Nucleic acid binder design. Sequence first.
RNA 1: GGGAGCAAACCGGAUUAGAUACCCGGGUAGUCCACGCCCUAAACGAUGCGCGCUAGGUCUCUGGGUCUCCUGGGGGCCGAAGCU
RNA 2: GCCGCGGUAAUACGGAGGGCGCGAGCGUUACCCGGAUUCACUGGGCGUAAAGGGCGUGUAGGCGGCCUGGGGCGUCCCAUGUGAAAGACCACGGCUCAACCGUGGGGGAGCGUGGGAUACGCUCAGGCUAGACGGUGGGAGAGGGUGGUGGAAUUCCCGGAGUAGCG
Lengths: 138, 234
Amino acid sequence: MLTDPIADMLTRIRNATRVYKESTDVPASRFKEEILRILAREGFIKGYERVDVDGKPYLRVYLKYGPRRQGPDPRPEQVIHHIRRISKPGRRVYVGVKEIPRVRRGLGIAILSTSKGVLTDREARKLGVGGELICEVW
Amino acid sequence: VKELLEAGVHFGHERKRWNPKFARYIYAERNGIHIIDLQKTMEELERTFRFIEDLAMRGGTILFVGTKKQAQDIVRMEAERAGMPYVNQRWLGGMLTNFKTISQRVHRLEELEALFASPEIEERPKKEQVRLKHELERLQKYLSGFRLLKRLPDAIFVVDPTKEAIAVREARKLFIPVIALADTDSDPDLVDYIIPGNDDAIRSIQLILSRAVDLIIQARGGVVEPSPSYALVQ
RNA sequence: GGGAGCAAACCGGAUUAGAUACCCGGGUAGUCCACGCCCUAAACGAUGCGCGCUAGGUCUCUGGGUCUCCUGGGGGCCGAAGCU
RNA sequence: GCCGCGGUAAUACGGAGGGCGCGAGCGUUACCCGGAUUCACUGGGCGUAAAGGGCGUGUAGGCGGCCUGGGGCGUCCCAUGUGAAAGACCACGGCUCAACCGUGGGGGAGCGUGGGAUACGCUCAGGCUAGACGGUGGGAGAGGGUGGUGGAAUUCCCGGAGUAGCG
């Protein structure tokens, strides 16, 4: 039944990236698209697209990876090293603007739902607003 | 000129004996055997040889490895037919990583070499004589190929790489470009430039070792006639 | 209620310094039926339940296919990534 | 203090010479926090280390797929009241310095009142079919209960034959 779509979405990404999967799908939801829209914009993915499997809406996510390297294990470094759900369904998390985090010293990002759509650490901070901390990405 | 030759008897190989990472490089599984896409191989030999050629015309040496039985002799030739080094017999341990020390076997081979019809055999008992003759024998047996190179190669060419996994390690630890001819059998992951095709039929083996050195010589100057292949094709 | 076989306890013979054992000859509950209690366990995969996701190879039980095979459910072995 | 030291050559006991620390103090004992991510929200775990409930069924509770609006409780933002003094924090001075001591500044989570936002959560209303249940048609099975029945063998009794041992 999936208790949280989001946390699985992120995971599927975390999971697809690990094997260097060209793309990977994930069942669709307007709120997810909103997320993924920031993931691409912030340069974590090439992007995505609405697709169809047996009539059912998915989102093919096109993943971005590092360049190939030398030495043993040539496996390219990642664009998404680590992606982790924050406000889970049991333990929800909220923050006013003054309380927002600076992810990885700012190299990474914190995403978050607010009354004004899904924003980021800088955006929201700048807008002057807060809301449910969703997840952290780097 | 390229796939027309290969479509003779030189494409597809293993059957469910395989490795899933060889995915992009495949066309169909007809006959329960995995048949590799040559149209993709075309585009590969291209980019492969771009590097090989580059290395050739800059006078940068290449070590050939082929221990497997249905491909040994085919190596001894091409390599000497380009004054470059090989390994026909057992892929010894630390040839590259402990080169330092394997190298000091050649600084014994040439020490025995300066004695094969010479005034010192006068001396030394018959014990040492046949013994040292029998030493040089195998000494020679393994380090005929490995010898021509007296300092780490800029790259390595290989047949079945899963069959010479030891080698691929040594090199790759030293950042030595790995290039090789591998198939379904083996994984593309850890080869820097790959010739994806049949690693068993002398047919497909030879054809690839042929046009290999040919391009070594053409980038060096003055291509000659082809060398032995139809030893006994049945 | 039943009781052939087996068998704690129990008794005989052995062995042994000793032999309340190990081996041998017997042997009572019990083992079985019904009905009612008892509620424990190396009750062990020593691995709570449901879901989604992340290479494949090999043999096996059971179903479905316009059945060299493809698909679904279950039981083992070897193992990608990863974890330890 | 913990690991430990002393059995005839002890840097660990006792004295001595020297040396390290701190200094009108220096040590001990007690107790609080710390180190202890050793009750773990931040920040731990349970195959074999201590840790999966013997297994089901379900009550309260916790949690909740996709889509559209109504509300705006959670949630966020804005203003404003409150958030005493002393303290702490920053400046600046008064004691010769300091400890003390004054002046001024800067704010405080909370909670009260107003305005606002609607993404997430909640709530009302509607819709969908991927979750879940139902329908038809088939299949494998030492799943359970009751009733009935077969043969192999052990044991005992009755009959026959047979003899010096069996075990």
